[PDB]
Amino acid sequence: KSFLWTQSLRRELSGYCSNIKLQVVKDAQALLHGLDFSEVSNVQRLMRKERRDDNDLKRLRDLNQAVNNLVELKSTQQKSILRVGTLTSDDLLILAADLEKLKSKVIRTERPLSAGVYMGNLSSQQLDQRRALLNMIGMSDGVVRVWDVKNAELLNNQFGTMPSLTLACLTKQGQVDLNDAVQALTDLGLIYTAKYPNTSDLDRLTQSHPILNMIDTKSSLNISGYNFSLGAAVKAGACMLDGGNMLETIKVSPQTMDGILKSILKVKKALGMFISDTPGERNPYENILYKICLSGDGWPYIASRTSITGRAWENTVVDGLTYSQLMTLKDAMLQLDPNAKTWMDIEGRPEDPVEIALYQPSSGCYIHFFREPTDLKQFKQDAKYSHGIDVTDLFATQPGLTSAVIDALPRNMVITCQGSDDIRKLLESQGRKDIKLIDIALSKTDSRKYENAVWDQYKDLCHMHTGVVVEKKEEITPHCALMDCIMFDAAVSGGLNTSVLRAVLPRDMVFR
Amino acid sequence: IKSFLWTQSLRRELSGYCSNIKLQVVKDAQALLHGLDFSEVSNVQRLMRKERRDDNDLKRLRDLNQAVNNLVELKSTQQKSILRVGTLTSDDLLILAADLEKLKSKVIRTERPLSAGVYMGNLSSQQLDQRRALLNMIGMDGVVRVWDVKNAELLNNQFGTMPSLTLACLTKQGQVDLNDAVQALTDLGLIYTAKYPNTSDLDRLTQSHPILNMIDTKKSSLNISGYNFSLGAAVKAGACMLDGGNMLETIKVSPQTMDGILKSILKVKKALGMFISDTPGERNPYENILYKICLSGDGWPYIASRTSITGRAWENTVVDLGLTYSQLMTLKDAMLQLDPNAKTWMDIEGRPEDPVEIALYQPSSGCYIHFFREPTDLKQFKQDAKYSHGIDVTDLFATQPGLTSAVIDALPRNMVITCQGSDDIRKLLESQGRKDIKLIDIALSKTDSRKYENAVWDQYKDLCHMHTGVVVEKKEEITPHCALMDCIMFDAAVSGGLTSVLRAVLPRDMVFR
Amino acid sequence: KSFLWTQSLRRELSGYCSNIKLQVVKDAQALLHGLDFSEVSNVQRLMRKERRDDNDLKRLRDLNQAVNNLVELKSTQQKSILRVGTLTSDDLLILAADLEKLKSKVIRTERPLSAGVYMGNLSSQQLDQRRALLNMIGMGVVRVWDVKNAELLNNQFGTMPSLTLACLTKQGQVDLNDAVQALTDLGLIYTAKYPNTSDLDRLTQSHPILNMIDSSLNISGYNFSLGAAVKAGACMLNMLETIKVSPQTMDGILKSILKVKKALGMFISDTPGERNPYENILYKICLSGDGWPYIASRTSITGRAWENTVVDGLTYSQLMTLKDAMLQLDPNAKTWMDIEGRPEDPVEIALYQPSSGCYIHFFREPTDLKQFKQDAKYSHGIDVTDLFATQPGLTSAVIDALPRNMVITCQGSDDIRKLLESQGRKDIKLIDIALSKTDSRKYENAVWDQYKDLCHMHTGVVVEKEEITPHCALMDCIMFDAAVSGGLLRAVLPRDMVFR
Ligand SMILES: [Mn+2]
Ligand SMILES: [Mn+2]
Ligand SMILES: [Mn+2]
Ligand SMILES: [Zn+2]
Ligand SMILES: [Zn+2]
Ligand SMILES: [Zn+2]
């Protein structure tokens, strides 16, 4: 039982819990006196949209920043490095392992909302599986995406619930006294000390506490802090309580972060807690671990966190692809349209490639990754005459992607390329003889007509090409497998449009 | 805890018999508010605060209870049940028999000493320690008792808690609107779906619902009444506000449904290993559910008014299919009423090797032991019935066997016993291994021993119905000899006078089967 | 706290201490000249075995006797009866309770090394708990000593400075003086603190002989623990290790230890494992009224400290020891059970697991002396006065400790059912075997021939008239098992728990 994990965590983490009612009420009062509740209404309206764009995200960000301005309970940016001490060597191994798993669960739950899942021309079975994933992650051409934004990073930390905001939006939007809302939330917390409240429980509590009618009882996914979900209601009430060992009231500091994680691992081991291999709602451990590693200075469950940058696996670090990374990769490749024109290009010989890219012009999605060379001698000749990569810069990239990606490519996909023989040689070598190739056969001059246009528009998309490259001598622009795909397509189309491209692989995957 | 798991399992198993009676409880509470004199509710609370209560106190309570019963719709009706093989199997009935027999003993031991009393005088401090622990467990001339009353049977069923009463009382006595009371009790029942609500829960609920700091958190369910604001009363009343959660409080029992309810309970008892405990004190969920359902075949076992019902659960529900361990523990506890230091007379009918009737009588307090035994030598018994005791052997069939050895074993060490002719008594006591008891032989002349014979029978005839035979002396008819009347009358003779209500040490339902 | 206890003890006991360096060295010289070190090596190899048997134990005991023969610093068998005098009435009551706690803690630490702990088919939680225990005491049945007679393990494991010194020299192939200078430096550290791993590691840099040193549990005097090395270095120098006790000094030393215990709040633990300095000195002192309790050869002493020094239901300590002895049972194995006496008034109870050969056997006083008499003449032949000697409360405590959902075999399940019911153990299922009387007692003579010495409680002539062999609950289990098997032991309970 998730609730048992929760009660176990409460018992063990009791000493880090605090009475915070006055603080939360105080912040709720600053919202009531300072915030525009018609903008709260407006962000509720945007979150009701099936498809939301950059203008929508900005209205959410600005509102989140107005709230963060008004409240005192906020987490501040704080990177944590965990070293052997209070945490043992083996504790550290457990944590790094579970952080890796949590990252896959979280990416697979949340990234599709922005990256998208192709839902067009596919088999009955592919659609059924994709639909299953879409439904489990709260998602309701042919690509389905909720957020169409230019920088998906701006979605980070913008959707947390906070007790002060919940209490203020109940008071103002439900049109009742603060005290009325605080007592109903109290009455609801008292329940949570004993069980996870359900619909039935809500219905009875609403009898005596009509304010609680605002609360939707029927997930925590694809929502915001402005929504009246059961989780946000139950969270706010856990704060209304004199004592109770509520996990929600925990405050973390650099002094207490290791001791709290140590206590969590003690509950984990005792109870067989685990990070799920499956997308969706967080279980109580995935939830605590995520919230704590986001910042070692704040209130993990209840503070304004909308000004925090980075993800939990990035803000806290422990000092082939795994099963976890392969699932994440598999789900990222669902964005691809298997029927669409697809370019592929490589740098390196096919027998020893160090840069690989695939590009789908009509949608703009691309696959771009790297690989450390086997033959160092041949690599240095290639660096000088072709690609200009410093091998030392490839040490930071993730291995095993080449097999994993090519293993994962769509059946009978049709790939277009300039280098046809080297592509075919590479795909044969990774056991993928079934993929049909189109050789485009551009002359050298024609192929590079749009080289400058392409670098001027897309230079930010690759930082790997640092070496001076020459042709027998005179300096030339280095060859980049991604730029090469894009410029070949421009050459074939007889022009290059202004267009945002969409990275299919998470950057967290290309690099380690 | 063990106990909440029993309650949850019982709730799930018995859902089909639970109902939505919020409407009907609130309505009865509305009728009390309209019709009941709450200054008398207040008077009965004052009586329940006293440490020693008497018959005029009892009459007030019974009179107020009849007033509540007159005004409410949720009452239980007098309804005897005989459980037979059918819905219940043959093995089921045997289990219910063994469990109603353990339940009888646990309940008597918790409740009986409140009226019958515990001697707390001149004893060893170890004896004082043990008895103290018992009185603590049950909410309790050197005797300690709560009810000093003529007929203790009048305390039966007068103390049960009722949700409508709790609701009406909080409201009128707490001077809040009924709505406030229901709402508070609702927010309390909700907790009860997941755990037993506690001091801390109620303390927190009180900030939000001031009407709840009426509940006296540090109060047992023992030695209390339906007019007391116990947590137990509130939790029960809160269970009824939900209209859901399969609360046992809402169960209705009828003649058509009793057997199936008992069958469900048994199913639960098997899966969890629920049991009737041998600890006097508060009732566990199984104990409580069995008691309440067996009280009556027609009504609402947990929540109706039960104050008009006569009899105990094991009398009202019966199974048609020497002392048990549970009877022996009841006896050992019953015997704590004796003052081991006080004048104590003894007399037997029947010869020492084959007694048929035994009495012990402490005249200072008025307590007595009186019981019977089947004769082994019937030729001699017949001789004794004609010339002494006039007892018909066939009337001894309904008496409990095994008490002779059990009572005599439980007599306190170094007791000093007085008798008329001490040879009879000595042989019987020694045969049981009690050479330690000293005897005084009083030696009254036959004429003097019987001076107050007519005056004893006049006062006390109701205490023994066993003597039915014409008894003669070589012939003239004479008054038959009773062990018990002989104790009283012999003491009268030594004392030069005989008026007083006596107390039986053994419950009747232990002397007879 | 530990070292402060030791230092406080150091101050009070100073007058009973002396310099014994010279004698320790002379005893070490007698070992170096007299002992076979290939056999020291042999017993070191035996100690590395996970499982040791009677053949190992005899090599250890033979080696201990050899060592004992060559040294002067030896304790001798000396029983002490403490009476009111130097020790007050209250002192005695304190020592009496503490010996009773020290006994539990010592047995619970040491007894599972031979008695064994079941580690087979159990729940996740039981396995977890049990491993914590095995871990604490240096340890499907896990056991280190598989021996016919566990009393032969008593006193065979003490560390002696003269042996530590003699072994370092000979096996570390250094000059005797080099071991002495090294041990002395350890000993100097020890005047101010318990040396730890970094102290030893720093000293090893300049006395390489100290690279020989690797808890005080499940080791012998032939082992190079830090503890034995510390002890040895303490005699090279107010050290406790140097105390000598005599029948004259016994009482006053005890009184002195009481004074420190009072001022410091020293206690005997309820934790199996290493002895704290108080448990340690109370143990070592009470073993014998004639010797050097920390440092002498103790290997010829018989008895345990609580047996060698006496003060002139179950206790909380006994209950603890009981719960732990019961772990030897295999809850899954065929288990027989049988009682003598009525189910409501039993006087003898047995349980027996034929596969491993463990049994549970104890007695209880009757409540009903009249009925007891009929049973004695016709069934058990027990004299009620022989029961005064036995320990009360075990019926409750043992049945409460039986593993949940056990499967018990018995002949006539009717009486076992009543006893178990009465003790609230409804969950135990019974197999009734239903053997006819004659078939039941076919192996009666063969069971008593093998097993007579296991029960001495049946003294009375029993009749059915003619003479018959009295009925014993243990013997019945065994012979009933035999009849079912068509053909024909370890005590689960400590004998000093079955009798008082
Ligand atoms: Mn290229
Ligand atoms: Mn008479
Ligand atoms: Mn037998
Ligand atoms: Zn590139
Ligand atoms: Zn009579
Ligand atoms: Zn025997």
Side-chain angles (χ1 to χ4, degrees), chain C residues 400-415:
Chain C
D400 286 0
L402 291 184
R404 216 82 167 121
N405 297 313
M406 273 217 75
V407 187
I408 288 207
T409 301
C410 59
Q411 208 224 341
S413 65
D414 238 306
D415 55 326

Side-chain angles (χ1 to χ4, degrees), chain C residues 338-340 441 471-473 476 480:
Chain C
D338 207 290
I339 75 172
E340 305 302 316
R441 303 199 175 273
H471 289 170
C472 176
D476 291 351
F480 296 167

Side-chain angles (χ1 to χ4, degrees), chain B residues 357 370 372 464 466-467 482-484:
Chain B
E357 176 184 39
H370 180 220
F372 308 91
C464 194
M466 192 63 61
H467 304 263
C482 173
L484 178 58

Side-chain angles (χ1 to χ4, degrees), chain C residues 86-116:
Chain C
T86 304
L87 298 166
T88 65
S89 155
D90 190 61
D91 288 329
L92 286 180
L93 287 181
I94 294 175
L95 296 161
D98 284 354
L99 286 169
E100 211 272 353
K101 296 171 181 106
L102 182 63
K103 181 185 156 156
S104 178
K105 180 260 158 70
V106 165
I107 287 174
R108 293 168 66 218
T109 299
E110 289 175 16
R111 189 175 177 276
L113 299 162
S114 50

Side-chain angles (χ1 to χ4, degrees), chain A residues 183 187 190-191 193-195 201 204-205 207-209 241-242 244, chain B residues 22 183 186-187 190-191 193-195 201 204-205 208-209 242-243:
Chain A
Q183 297 313 148
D187 282 13
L190 309 162
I191 312 316
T193 61
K195 65 193 304 203
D201 302 332
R204 296 294 104 183
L205 261 193
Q207 299 269 300
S208 58
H209 292 280
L241 300 188
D242 262 8
Chain B
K22 173 180 179 163
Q183 287 171 340
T186 306
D187 312 0
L190 280 183
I191 297 335
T193 65
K195 77 186 291 218
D201 298 323
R204 293 184 300 252
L205 260 178
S208 175
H209 298 270
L242 310 176
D243 285 347

